[PDB]
Amino acid sequence: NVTLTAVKKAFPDALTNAELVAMVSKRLSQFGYHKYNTLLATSLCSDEVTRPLEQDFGEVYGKHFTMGGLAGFPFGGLTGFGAMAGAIPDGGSCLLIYGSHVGVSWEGKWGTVARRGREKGGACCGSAVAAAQAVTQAYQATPLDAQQGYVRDMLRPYAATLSEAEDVMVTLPVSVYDAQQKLVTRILDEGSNHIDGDGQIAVVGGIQINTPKEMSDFFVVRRFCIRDSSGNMVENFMPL
C-alpha cells in the first residue's frame, strides 16, 4: 500500500500492465489492429525488469521486434526501424511500445527495486542513474561502451533540470522519456517511406514503473497515437 500510494502520488494517471494492455488493444481494435495483421515492436531498457511489459503485449500481438537498448533508447535506429517495417504483415500495421523505466521500492523510494535473489537491488534504471550522475556532476562543475555514451549525450541537456529536481529519481525517468520521445519522432519521420500505403504505425510511449514482485507493474502513458504512411498523425488518443 505504501508503494501503491507512492506510485499514484507521483503519477496519478498510472495504469497497471493489465489495464494498459486492455486499454490499448481495445482502442486499436476499433482501428483494425488485430493479431494476424499487427507487428509488435518495443523500445525498452535491456534490464530484465522490463520483460513483463513485453510479455503482456506479446500475449496479444505475438513475437516482437526490439529496437531498444540501455535506458530504453531506440538504438536500433533507422536500420532497425526499416527491418521492422519490412516485417509488417501485408496491408497490416506496427504497434511500437517505448519508454523509460524506474523502480519503486517496498518503502516507496524511487530509483531502486528489489531484485530476485539479491539483498541489495541497486539502481533502476541503472543506466539512466549512472548517466544522470555523470552529466549533473559535470554541470555542477559549472562500440565497446558506445550505448552508455549515447545515454549521457542525450541526458546532458537535462543536467540543470536534474540538479534542481526535488526528487531526481522521479524527474530522471521523465527526462529520459522526453529524450526518447524526440528520438523516436525523428526516426519515424525519417523512416516514413518504409511503411506501405495503407499501413500505419501506432505508438505508445511513457514511463514503465517496476514494483516489488508481489505487485503489478505500472505504466504512465504520455503518448498514444496513430501515424500514417506519410508520417502524418491521424489519431491522437491523449489524454486518457
The binding site for Zn ion (CB under 5 A) comprises: 45, 47, 125, 127
In the bound state with Zn ion, the residue whose beta carbon lies nearer, of 25 and 180, is 180
Q: Give the Cα separation of 133 and 128 in Å (integer).
A: 9
Q: Give the Cα separation of 121 and 130 in Å (integer).
A: 15
Grid coordinates of 132: 544522470
138 scored as a contact of a copy of itself (CB under 8 A): no
178 scored as a contact of a copy of itself (CB under 8 A): no
Grid coordinates of 192: 516514413
The DSSP output letter for 52 is H
Q: Give the Cα separation of 140 and 196 in Å (integer).
A: 48
CB of 220 to Zn ion, least distance (A): 15
In the bound state with a copy of itself, the residue whose beta carbon lies nearer, of 8 and 86, is 86
Alpha helices (H) in the chain, listed in sequence order? 2-10, 17-29, 51-61, 77-85, 126-140, 146-155, 159-163, 168-190
| Of the candidate residues 16, 23, 27, 37, the single one contacting a copy of itself (CB under 8 A) | 37
Grid coordinates of 23: 486499454
Size of the site for a copy of itself (CB under 8 A): 55
In the bound state with Zn ion, the residue whose beta carbon lies nearer, of 153 and 198, is 153
- The contact set with a copy of itself (CB under 8 A) reads 36-37, 39-40, 46-49, 51-52, 62-70, 73, 75-80, 83, 86-90, 92, 115-119, 122, 126-127, 130, 143-148, 150, 153-154, 183, 186-187, 190
